């Protein structure tokens, strides 16, 4: 007790000095390209699913300090890395941007997230190096290949190119990264923002003119022109991103089975009662009639939803916060008595 009661005072002493100091510090979240592979969504990665390396850094510390700590921590030379701060934009995108105190560089943002380009350690073992970047005449671009058969996106890395380069001149690389033959016919889009995927028509103009509002971190999506895919449910990247925009995963818990973890169903925000009900039924091998849904409140099932509801799944889900997992309670009614 005697020496035990001193340690309980030492712990409250150290934990209060840290509470006071915590305003002097900021999070820097380092995200690495390997996290972009497999991402099926808009922009480069999912904020929630991605995995960061995390740095606790004095707000008024310098960049050079961070870089040094960074290169030594991560195990790279200082001149074999490039920092591309992630920038939340007004149009609803977050993108690597181009790059005094850390906090002023983050534009007061905290946590600050940064895309750290490095060389692939495998390829660097055989003499690969960080390519240089004329911050004025070059642009960094991201490539995605859409496959209409599987209706999926396939990250195809990034490229450094002179801004003055023709779109046509990039086709060989897209074809190659996608595993296609040179001079395979491609349809190209700028992924602009969610629900905006503009086709690029003139391939014989510079990148400044081809994309609207050209910046580093811009994304071009491409795809074959295979006829077998006219058949497909989402024949183009444009249509794929539209489907995605209106997409939502909802968890359905059976109110009568308490603590039922429930199951996830992928629905559309622009569905109606019938569509919602019918989908969930096909999952349970039952009749839509036999399902009663309850509204969303608190945690717990709310008021019962009436089957003549005229609204949309959006309307039902409009009281959920961005990070909140979307859940609706239901229960099953009897066929006979």
């Amino acid at each position: 007790l005697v020496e035990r009661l001193q340690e309980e005072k030492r712990i409250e002493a150290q934990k209060r000095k840290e509470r006071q100091e915590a305003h002097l510090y900021m999070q820097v979240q380092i995200v690495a390209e390997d996290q972009f592979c497999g991402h099926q969504g808009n922009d480069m990665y999912d904020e929630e699913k991605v995995k960061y390396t995390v740095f606790k850094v004095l707000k008024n510390s310098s960049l050079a300090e961070f870089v040094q700590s960074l290169s030594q921590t991560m195990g790279f030379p200082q001149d074999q890395i490039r920092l591309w701060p992630m920038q939340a934009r007004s149009n609803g995108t977050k993108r690597p941007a181009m790059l005094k105190t850390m906090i002023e560089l983050s534009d007061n943002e905290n946590p600050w997230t940064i895309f750290l380009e490095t060389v692939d350690p495998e390829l660097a073992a055989s003499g690969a190096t960080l390519p240089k970047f004329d911050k004025d005449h070059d642009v960094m671009l991201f490539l995605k290949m859409y496959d209409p058969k599987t209706r999926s996106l396939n990250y195809c890395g990034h490229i450094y190119t002179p801004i003055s380069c023709k779109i046509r001149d990039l086709l060989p690389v897209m074809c190659d990264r996608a595993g296609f033959i040179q001079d395979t016919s491609l349809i190209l889009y700028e992924e602009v923002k969610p629900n905006l995927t503009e086709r690029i028509q003139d391939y014989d103009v510079s990148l400044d003119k081809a994309l609207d509002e050209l910046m580093d971190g811009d994304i071009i999506v491409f795809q074959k022109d295979d006829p077998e895919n006219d058949n497909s449910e989402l024949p183009t990247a444009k249509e794929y991103f539209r489907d995605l925009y209106h997409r939502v995963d909802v968890i359905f818990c059976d109110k009568t089975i308490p603590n039922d973890p429930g199951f996830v169903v992928t629905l559309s925000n622009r569905m109606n009662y019938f569509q919602v009900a019918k989908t969930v039924a096909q999952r349970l091998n039952t009749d839509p009639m036999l399902l009663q849904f309850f509204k969303s409140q608190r945690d717990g099932p709310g008021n019962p939803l009436r089957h003549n509801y005229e609204g949309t799944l959006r309307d039902l889900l409009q009281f959920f916060k961005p990070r909140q997992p979307k859940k609706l309670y239901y229960q099953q009614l009897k066929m006979k008595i």
Binding site: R89, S90, N91, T93, D136, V139, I163, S164, S206, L207, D208, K209, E213, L214, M215, D216
Partner: peptide, 9 residues
């Protein structure tokens, strides 16, 4: 030719 400094739509 140049990059834009900011998006606006």
């Amino acid at each position: 030719p140049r990059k834009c400094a900011r998006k606006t739509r």
